[PDB]
């Protein structure tokens, strides 16, 4: 989706819309719904999130919490163009991206778009938190100069 600013963010987290969050995290929500006992078969859970009842948003805030995502601007040239954030849910339809991080992506806000990817397995969540987190990329790998310079 299209990116936008959101300057209230801390630089390890990015804004991610509720509609994209409920679509990307359908199996985690299914697993959470089946754990509580609200439903029985898988079909029931797919009808629940197809209807989007009042109880799946708490399920969604309980699958987001410590689960990083890989934001990626479309011409990725160096390794600082894939960085992992923690989602903060957004009423809206636009990815809110912390401004300092923009100087790494070469991302202005003149109509840009970014892709989100979900680390599924557990080793991938740990690689997103321990190697690819946006707090971990504060120096450019080409030299010693900081890449989270205020723009």
């Amino acid at each position: 989706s299209v990116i936008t600013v959101g300057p209230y963010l801390r630089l390890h987290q990015c804004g991610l819309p509720k509609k994209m969050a409920l679509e990307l995290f359908k199996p985690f929500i299914y697993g959470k719904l089946e754990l509580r006992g609200l439903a029985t078969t898988i079909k029931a859970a797919k009808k629940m999130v197809e209807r989007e009842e009042a109880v799946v948003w708490d399920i969604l805030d309980e699958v987001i919490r410590e689960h990083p995502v890989l934001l990626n601007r479309a011409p990725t040239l160096h390794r600082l163009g894939i960085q992992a954030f923690e989602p903060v849910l957004i009423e809206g339809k636009a990815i809110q991206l912390h401004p300092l991080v923009c100087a790494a992506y070469n991302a202005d806000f003149d109509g840009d778009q970014m892709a989100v990817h979900v680390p599924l397995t557990l080793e991938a969540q740990l690689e997103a938190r321990a190697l690819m987190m946006s707090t971990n990329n504060i120096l450019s790998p080409a030299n010693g100069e900081p890449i989270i310079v205020p723009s």
């Binding site: 801390r10 410590e66 557990l122 740990l126 690689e127 938190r129 321990a130 971990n136």
Partner: protein, 82 residues
Amino acid sequence: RVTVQDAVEKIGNRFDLVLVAARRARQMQVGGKDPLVPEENDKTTVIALREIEEGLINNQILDVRERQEQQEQEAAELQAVT
């Protein structure tokens, strides 16, 4: 949770951190083991790195505990048989 700096201060490789924390989170999630630090309804990944930061888990202690809790199971089987 924001930074993982001391979890690399105690395991210097920064790649062995991922193996030790993945082994620890797989023991806590599916195997049903209790966390050694009291949580705040964190997910098992952050509880793994939070145990790494206390120092009470690395690869040495995990091999010690897997050998002792495999010898305990086989000892229970042998004392049940004979």
